[model samples]
Target: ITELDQTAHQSDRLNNALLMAIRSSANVSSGFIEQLGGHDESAGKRMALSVELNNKSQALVDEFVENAREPALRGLATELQATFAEYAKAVAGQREATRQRSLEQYFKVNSDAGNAMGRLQTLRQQLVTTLSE
Candidate 1:
């Protein structure tokens, strides 16, 4: 079972890393939108990049989930999937809000991102617990 545990731990770590990278990208994109005066074109491009990053991360998670043989690990993957879906919706809402308003509305973007980060932290904890068990 050591190999199974190692694989699951590795997958969890990879997922966590991907989530962190995506979060950083989102923050950077938000900063650019605000600092650059909310140019619609620029914001649109950054949003597209964020979406692409998210898609890639989600694909990785899906692959891990598919390969996971342990029931508990698979359940954690399911939870991650659900949480990521919620995160995507929140991100979309923030993007739309930014498009509608000026990026000077920094508070909204930060708040939305903050909330998403909280959910991500929770997901990470769940993943860790699954791996430990």
Candidate 2:
């Protein structure tokens, strides 16, 4: 439970940063589009010595998309790594604590926290009766 809580919290922060990267990429694309708009191409490109620009502009556009995606994917990768680390640690602690106790001892610890187990309750009751008699 605690591990899930921390994983969710940390992942939320990572997603928020990814949003900023998305905004940055959008901003760069828009800047390029705005520059392209400045061209006097309606009829100004009478093809005198025009070094056509569509191909070059697309290169800039494609580059920014990759730059944004790179970090966005990397952030998700980092989140998964940290989440798994927390999960491993949590499971390790839980497993160690459990292995140290007998079934009856472990049941009592969980039952104290209201963890329910019908079979264990019956088993414990029968054992209790015989032990008492």
Candidate 3:
């Protein structure tokens, strides 16, 4: 039981760290996209990077889910998986919407990646507490 608790805590920490890394990568990609003057091709590259980040996030989620021993922790892991899936879909939709718009019309706005990460971090902290309980 103690080992399970430790594993759950570690998974929570790792998942949150991965979320931060993805957010950081997205920020870098956003900067590059902006520097490219919001070109369609640059948007496409950004979309590709977003996909990669999504993949990495999903992988981390899978790892955490697989390691979770407690039933509640497992449920939380599933929720995290679903959350990331929705997040990825939202990003994909945004990229498509931007692609459809004219480059001149597409303003380089701040990406929501950091905000999403913050939310995930909060959730992870909550999950850690829940698992400890």
What are the per-model C-alpha RMSD values against the true structure? 4.0, 28.7, 4.8
- Please give, for residues 14-104, the per-residue lDDT of candidate 3 as tens digits: 6654664566356445734664574656556666666676667666666777777577777777777666555555455455545554343
Q: Which stretches of model 2 miss by more than 4 angstroms?
A: 39-133
Task: Rank the candidate models, highest TM-score first.
Answer: 1, 3, 2
Model 1 accuracy (lDDT, Cα): 0.64
Q: Report the lDDT tens digits of candidate 2 across residue range 1-133.
A: 8544443443333343333323332332333333346643432332211112322322332332333234434443433333323332332332233335334443444332222223323433443343232
Model 1 misplacement above 4 A: 1-13, 24-32, 35-41, 102-113
lDDT of 1 by residue, 1-133 (tens): 8776667666664565466446635754574555467466666666667667666766666666676557767777777767666666656656665555656554566576667668777877777666655
* Local error of candidate 1 at residue 21 (angstroms): 6.4
**What C-alpha lDDT does candidate 3 achieve relative to the native structure?**
0.59
Residue clash pairs of candidate 2: none
Q: Scored by CA lDDT, what does every candidate get? A: 0.64, 0.34, 0.59
Q: Quote the lDDT for 93 in model 3.
A: 45
Evaluate residue 48 in candidate 1 and report its C-alpha lDDT on the 0 to 100 scale: 69
- Regions more than 4 Å wrong, model 3: 1-9, 16-45, 102-119, 131-133
Q: Go through the candidates in order and give the clash count of each.
A: 0, 0, 0
